Amino acid sequence: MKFNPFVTSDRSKNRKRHFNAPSHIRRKIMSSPLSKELRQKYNVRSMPIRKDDEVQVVRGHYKGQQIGKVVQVYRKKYVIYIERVQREKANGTTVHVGIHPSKVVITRLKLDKDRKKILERKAKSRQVGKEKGK
Partner 1 sequence: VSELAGHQTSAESWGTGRAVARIPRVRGGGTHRSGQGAFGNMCRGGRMFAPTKTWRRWHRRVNTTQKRYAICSALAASALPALVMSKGHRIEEVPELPLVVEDKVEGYKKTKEAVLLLKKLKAWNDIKKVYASQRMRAGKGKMRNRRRIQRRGPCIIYNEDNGIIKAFRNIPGITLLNVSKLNILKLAPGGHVGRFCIWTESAFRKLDELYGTWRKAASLKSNYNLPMHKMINTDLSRILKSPEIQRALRAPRKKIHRRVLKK
Question: Could you say which residues in the range 11-70 bind partner 1, by CB under 8 A?
Answer: 11
Binding region for partner 1 (CB under 8 A) out of 4-12, 17-25, 32-40, 104-112: 4-12
Does residue number 72 form part of the binding site for RNA (CB under 7 A)?
yes
Asked whether 103 and 80 are in contact (CB, 8 A), the reply is no
User: What is the rounded CA–CA span in Å between residue 80 and residue 63?
Assistant: 15
Nearer to partner 1, 11 or 76 (CB): 11
Choose which of 28, 41, 84, 116 interacts with RNA (CB under 7 A): 28
Nearer residue to partner 1 within complex by CB, 1 or 90: 1
